[PDB]
Amino acid sequence: RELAILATAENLLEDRPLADISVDDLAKGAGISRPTFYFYFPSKEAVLLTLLDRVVNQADMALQTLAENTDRENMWRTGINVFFETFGSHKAVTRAGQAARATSVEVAELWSTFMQKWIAYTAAVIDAERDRGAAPRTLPAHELATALNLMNERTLFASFAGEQPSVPEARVLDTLVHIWVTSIYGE
Amino acid sequence: RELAILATAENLLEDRPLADISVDDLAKGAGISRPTFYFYFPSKEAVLLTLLDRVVNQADMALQTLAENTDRENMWRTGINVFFETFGSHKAVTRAGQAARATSVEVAELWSTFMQKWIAYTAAVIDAERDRGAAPRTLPAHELATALNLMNERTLFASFAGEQPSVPEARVLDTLVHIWVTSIYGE
Ligand SMILES: CCOC(=O)Cc1nc(-c2ccc(S(=O)(=O)NCCC(F)(F)F)cc2)cs1
Ligand SMILES: CCOC(=O)Cc1nc(-c2ccc(S(=O)(=O)NCCC(F)(F)F)cc2)cs1
Numbered sequence: 545r546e547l548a549i550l551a552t553a554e555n556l557l558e559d560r561p562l563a564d565i566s567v568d569d570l571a572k573g574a575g576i577s578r579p580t581f582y583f584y585f586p587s588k589e590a591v592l593l594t595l596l597d598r599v600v601n602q603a604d605m606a607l608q609t610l611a612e613n614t615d616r617e618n619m620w621r622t623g624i625n626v627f628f629e630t631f632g633s634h635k636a637v638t639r640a641g642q643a644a645r646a647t648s649v650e651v652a653e654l655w656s657t658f659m660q661k662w663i664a665y666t667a668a669v670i671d672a673e674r675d676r677g678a679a680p681r682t683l684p685a686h687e688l689a690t691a692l693n694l695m696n697e698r699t700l701f702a703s704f705a706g707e708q709p710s711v712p713e714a715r716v717l718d719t720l721v722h723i724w725v726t727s728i729y730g731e
Numbered sequence: 732r733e734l735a736i737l738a739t740a741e742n743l744l745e746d747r748p749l750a751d752i753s754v755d756d757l758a759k760g761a762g763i764s765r766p767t768f769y770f771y772f773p774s775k776e777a778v779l780l781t782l783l784d785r786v787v788n789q790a791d792m793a794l795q796t797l798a799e800n801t802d803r804e805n806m807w808r809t810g811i812n813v814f815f816e817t818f819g820s821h822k823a824v825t826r827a828g829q830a831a832r833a834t835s836v837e838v839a840e841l842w843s844t845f846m847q848k849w850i851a852y853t854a855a856v857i858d859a860e861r862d863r864g865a866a867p868r869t870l871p872a873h874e875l876a877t878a879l880n881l882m883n884e885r886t887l888f889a890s891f892a893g894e895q896p897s898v899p900e901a902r903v904l905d906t907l908v909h910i911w912v913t914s915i916y917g918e
Binding site for chain 1 (some may be wrong): 779816830839842846847850868869870871874875877878879880882884885886889896897898899902903906907909910911912913914916917918
C-alpha cells in the first residue's frame with residue numbers, strides 16, 4: 545500500500561503538477577481511503593520527498609557500483625551516464641522534486657546533501673588523476689567539480705523538461721562529456 | 732514615483748522574499764497610497780518583472796558594447812564578467828527573479844528570450860574562432876554554447892545566493908573562465 549501510493553504519485557506526476565494532485569487522487573489510485581493514506585504519509589509533499597529520496601539513492605548506489613569496480617573519456621562518460629539514465633528514467637519525479645526545492649526544506653536539504661557527496665567524489669577522482677600525472681594541476685579540484693556538477697544539474701534537467709533553451713536529450717551526454725574531459729585534462 | 736516604487740522593491744527584496752512584501756510596503760516606501768500604486772503597476776509581481784527586465788537589459792547592453800569594439804582567455808573573461816558584475820550588483824533582484832520563473836510565465840519568457848540571445852551570440856563567437864582556425868571543430872557550437880550558458884546561470888546564481896553547494900563568489904569567475912576556454916579550445 546506504501547508502494548501503491550508511491551507508484552500512483554509517480555504516474556500522476558507524469559500528467560500534472562503536485563499542486564494539481566490531491567490526497568484523494570493518491571488514495572483512490574492506491575485503492576485505500578484518505579484517512580488510510582494519512583497512516584502512510586503526513587502529506588502529498590512527503591510522498592514526493594520519498595519518491596525523490598529513492599531516485600537520488602538509486603543514482604548514488606549506481607555511482608558507488610562504478611567506484612568499487614577503459615580510457616579517461618569513457619570513465620567520465622560512464623559516471624555522467626548514471627545520472628542521465630537514472631534521472632532520465634524518472635523525469636516526472638526529477639521535475640517535481642527540483643520544483644519542490646523552492647518550497648520544501650527537506651527536499652532542498654536532500655538535494656544539497658547528495659550534491660555535496662557527488663562533488664566530493666568528482667574532486668577525489670580529479671585529484672587521483674592529478675596524483676598519477678594524467679590531469680594537470682589547474683583549478684582547485686573541488687571548485688572545478690562544483691561547477692561541473694551544477695552544469696550537469698541545470699543542463700540534464702533543462703533537457704529532460706524540454707526547456708527553451710536546452711540541449712536536445714539525444715545530444716546532452718556527448719555535450720557534458722566533452723566539457724568534463726576538456727576542463728579536467730586541458731591546460 | 733515609478734522609480735521610487737522600483738527602488739523600494741529592490742531595497743525590500745534585499746531583506747525578504749516577494750511573498751513577504753505587500754503593495755502597502757511598496758506604496759509606503761515610495762511615498763504614495765495603495766490605489767496610487769495600482770496606477771503604475773497591476774501587482775507586486777509586475778514590479779519584480781520590471782526590475783528583472785532592467786537588470787537583464789543592462790547585462791545585454793554591456794555585452795553589445797564589448798561586441799561592437801587581447802588574448803582569447805581575456806576575451807571570454809571580459810564577457811563572462813558582464814554577467815558576474817551586472818547580476819552580482821543586483822543579487823536580490825537576481826534571486827527573486829529566478830524564483831519567479833516557476834510562478835510567472837512573463838518572467839520565464841523574459842529569461843528564456845535573453846538566454847536564447849546570449850547562447851546564439853556565444854555560438855557565433857565560437858564559430859568565428861573556428862573559421863579563423865583558433866578553435867577546433869569539436870561539438871556543434873550551439874550545443875556547447877547552450878551547456879556553457881546553463882552552467883553560468885546555475886553556478887553564478889548559486890554563488891550569489893551562498894547555496895550549499897556553490898563556488899565561493901571570489902573564485903567563480905576564474906572557475907567559469909577555465910571551463911569555457913578549455914572546452915572551446917580543447918580537442
Ligand atoms: C572510477 C569511477 O569514476 C567515475 O565513474 C567517474 C566519475 N563520475 C562522477 C560524477 C559525479 C557527478 C556527476 S553529475 O554532475 O552528473 N551529478 C550531479 C548533478 C545531477 F545529479 F543533477 F546530475 C557525474 C559524474 C564522479 S567520479
Ligand atoms: C568579441 C566579444 O566577445 C566576447 O565578449 C566573449 C563572449 N562572451 C559571451 C558570453 C555569453 C553568455 C555568458 S553567460 O553564460 O555568463 N550568460 C548567461 C547566463 C547568465 F545570464 F545567467 F549569466 C558569458 C559570456 C558571448 S561572446
